Design a protein around this motif. Structure first.
Motif, PDB file in Angstrom:
ATOM      1  N   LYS A 137      -5.414 -11.205 -18.434  1.00 50.13           N
ATOM      2  CA  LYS A 137      -4.669  -9.985 -18.331  1.00 50.13           C
ATOM      3  C   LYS A 137      -3.548 -10.119 -17.315  1.00 50.13           C
ATOM      4  O   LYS A 137      -2.405  -9.649 -17.632  1.00 50.13           O
ATOM      5  CB  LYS A 137      -5.461  -8.718 -17.898  1.00 50.13           C
TER       6      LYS A 137
ATOM      7  N   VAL B 107      -5.491   1.524  -8.918  1.00 50.85           N
ATOM      8  CA  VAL B 107      -6.512   0.478  -8.893  1.00 50.85           C
ATOM      9  C   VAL B 107      -6.364  -0.433  -7.657  1.00 50.85           C
ATOM     10  O   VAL B 107      -7.378  -0.792  -7.022  1.00 50.85           O
ATOM     11  CB  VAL B 107      -6.494  -0.427 -10.130  1.00 50.85           C
TER      12      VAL B 107
ATOM     13  N   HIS C 174      -0.258  -9.279  -0.018  1.00 48.65           N
ATOM     14  CA  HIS C 174      -1.067 -10.108  -0.897  1.00 48.65           C
ATOM     15  C   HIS C 174      -0.357 -10.660  -2.091  1.00 48.65           C
ATOM     16  O   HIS C 174      -0.742 -11.646  -2.736  1.00 48.65           O
ATOM     17  CB  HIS C 174      -2.240  -9.286  -1.566  1.00 48.65           C
ATOM     18  N   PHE C 175       0.720 -10.014  -2.494  1.00 52.56           N
ATOM     19  CA  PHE C 175       1.468 -10.402  -3.753  1.00 52.56           C
ATOM     20  C   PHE C 175       2.030 -11.792  -3.753  1.00 52.56           C
ATOM     21  O   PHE C 175       1.870 -12.429  -4.805  1.00 52.56           O
ATOM     22  CB  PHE C 175       2.509  -9.266  -4.074  1.00 52.56           C
TER      23      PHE C 175
HETATM   24  C1  HEM Z   1       2.073  -8.844 -10.817  1.00 53.73           C
HETATM   25  C2  HEM Z   1       0.918  -8.961 -10.064  1.00 53.73           C
HETATM   26  C3  HEM Z   1      -0.446  -8.392 -10.500  1.00 53.73           C
HETATM   27  C4  HEM Z   1      -0.875  -8.111 -11.741  1.00 53.73           C
HETATM   28  C5  HEM Z   1      -0.143  -8.127 -13.102  1.00 53.73           C
HETATM   29  C6  HEM Z   1      -2.271  -7.687 -11.644  1.00 53.73           C
HETATM   30  C7  HEM Z   1      -3.021  -7.270 -12.745  1.00 53.73           C
HETATM   31  C8  HEM Z   1      -4.240  -6.650 -12.473  1.00 53.73           C
HETATM   32  C9  HEM Z   1      -5.019  -6.068 -13.569  1.00 53.73           C
HETATM   33  C10 HEM Z   1      -4.492  -6.065 -15.016  1.00 53.73           C
HETATM   34  C11 HEM Z   1      -6.147  -5.632 -13.039  1.00 53.73           C
HETATM   35  C12 HEM Z   1      -7.278  -4.948 -13.855  1.00 53.73           C
HETATM   36  C13 HEM Z   1      -7.047  -3.460 -14.117  1.00 53.73           C
HETATM   37  C14 HEM Z   1      -8.248  -2.913 -14.888  1.00 53.73           C
HETATM   38  O1  HEM Z   1      -8.523  -3.604 -15.929  1.00 53.73           O
HETATM   39  O2  HEM Z   1      -8.841  -1.958 -14.291  1.00 53.73           O
HETATM   40  C15 HEM Z   1      -6.171  -5.936 -11.640  1.00 53.73           C
HETATM   41  C16 HEM Z   1      -7.208  -5.710 -10.744  1.00 53.73           C
HETATM   42  C17 HEM Z   1      -7.361  -6.238  -9.470  1.00 53.73           C
HETATM   43  N1  HEM Z   1      -6.393  -7.001  -8.826  1.00 53.73           N
HETATM   44 FE1  HEM Z   1      -4.527  -7.362  -9.689  1.00 53.73          FE
HETATM   45  N2  HEM Z   1      -2.696  -7.897 -10.343  1.00 53.73           N
HETATM   46  C18 HEM Z   1      -1.608  -8.262  -9.624  1.00 53.73           C
HETATM   47  C19 HEM Z   1      -1.622  -8.527  -8.243  1.00 53.73           C
HETATM   48  C20 HEM Z   1      -2.736  -8.602  -7.408  1.00 53.73           C
HETATM   49  C21 HEM Z   1      -2.773  -9.126  -6.065  1.00 53.73           C
HETATM   50  C22 HEM Z   1      -1.575  -9.535  -5.255  1.00 53.73           C
HETATM   51  C23 HEM Z   1      -4.063  -9.019  -5.643  1.00 53.73           C
HETATM   52  C24 HEM Z   1      -4.730  -9.385  -4.287  1.00 53.73           C
HETATM   53  C25 HEM Z   1      -4.794 -10.653  -3.898  1.00 53.73           C
HETATM   54  C26 HEM Z   1      -4.850  -8.416  -6.723  1.00 53.73           C
HETATM   55  C27 HEM Z   1      -6.214  -8.113  -6.652  1.00 53.73           C
HETATM   56  C28 HEM Z   1      -6.917  -7.329  -7.572  1.00 53.73           C
HETATM   57  C29 HEM Z   1      -8.297  -6.860  -7.495  1.00 53.73           C
HETATM   58  C30 HEM Z   1      -9.205  -7.054  -6.262  1.00 53.73           C
HETATM   59  C31 HEM Z   1      -8.557  -6.223  -8.645  1.00 53.73           C
HETATM   60  C32 HEM Z   1      -9.864  -5.457  -9.081  1.00 53.73           C
HETATM   61  C33 HEM Z   1     -10.806  -6.323  -9.907  1.00 53.73           C
HETATM   62  C34 HEM Z   1     -12.275  -6.110  -9.585  1.00 53.73           C
HETATM   63  O3  HEM Z   1     -12.588  -4.900  -9.395  1.00 53.73           O
HETATM   64  O4  HEM Z   1     -12.995  -7.150  -9.512  1.00 53.73           O
HETATM   65  N3  HEM Z   1      -3.991  -8.210  -7.830  1.00 53.73           N
HETATM   66  N4  HEM Z   1      -4.992  -6.607 -11.321  1.00 53.73           N
END
Ligand code: HEM
Length: 153
Positions: A66, A96, A106-107
């Motif tokens: 995703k 979220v 973090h990004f």
């Molecule tokens: C363009 C950058 C990013 C995209 C496209 C992205 C995409 C997503 C998506 C699609 C979800 C799941 C939403 C759902 O299905 O509820 C998610 C959850 C999450 N993301 Fe990202 N993310 C990005 C950046 C980041 C960064 C920088 C971090 C931290 C290092 C991060 C950490 C998390 C965490 C901790 C979750 C929750 C998953 C869980 O509950 O285990 N994301 N992100």
């Protein structure tokens, strides 16, 4: 800056290749995240408590799949429209990420881990143009998600 039609075509080509071996390449992606920033381990439910990054975990696999698909889809929308459209889906991603304790700083971690994953996926096909394209796509997508984070108090 760019995304010319040949930059978009390269993101698309590389994304297909990534998607051809989801179990391998998603595992690799999470290994590279933790090499950049070991402390990030704690944010991900499917990692927290593990010894090594799981190799056959469907939650890990769907999550990273995703991530890559949204950056690729951002690449194509910048190329066709000239923007990244802020929809309800990215609004929901802003909330979220604030909930799970993700912050602007973090990004860059996930950026570098994506650039290095794609580098390993394409092998000898890698180019500077390829790298720039995924970089722009990621940056423009991140701007919109960060705005909605900032907005999604
Ligand atoms: C363009 C950058 C990013 C995209 C496209 C992205 C995409 C997503 C998506 C699609 C979800 C799941 C939403 C759902 O299905 O509820 C998610 C959850 C999450 N993301 Fe990202 N993310 C990005 C950046 C980041 C960064 C920088 C971090 C931290 C290092 C991060 C950490 C998390 C965490 C901790 C979750 C929750 C998953 C869980 O509950 O285990 N994301 N992100």
């Amino acid at each position: 800056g760019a995304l010319t039609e040949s930059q978009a075509a390269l993101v698309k080509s590389s994304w297909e290749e990534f998607n051809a071996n989801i179990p391998k390449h998603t595992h690799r992606f999470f290994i590279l995240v933790l090499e950049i920033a070991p402390a990030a381990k704690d944010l991900f439910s499917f990692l927290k408590g593990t010894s090594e990054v799981p190799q056959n975990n469907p939650e890990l696999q769907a999550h990273a799949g995703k991530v890559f698909k949204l950056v690729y889809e951002a690449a194509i929308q910048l190329e066709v429209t000239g923007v990244v459209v802020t929809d309800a889906t990215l609004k929901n991603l802003g909330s979220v990420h604030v909930s799970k304790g993700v912050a602007d700083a973090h990004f860059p971690v996930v950026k570098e881990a994506i650039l290095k994953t794609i580098k390993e996926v394409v092998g000898a096909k890698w180019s500077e143009e390829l790298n720039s394209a995924w970089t722009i796509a990621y940056d423009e997508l991140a701007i919109v998600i960060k705005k909605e984070m900032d907005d999604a108090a």
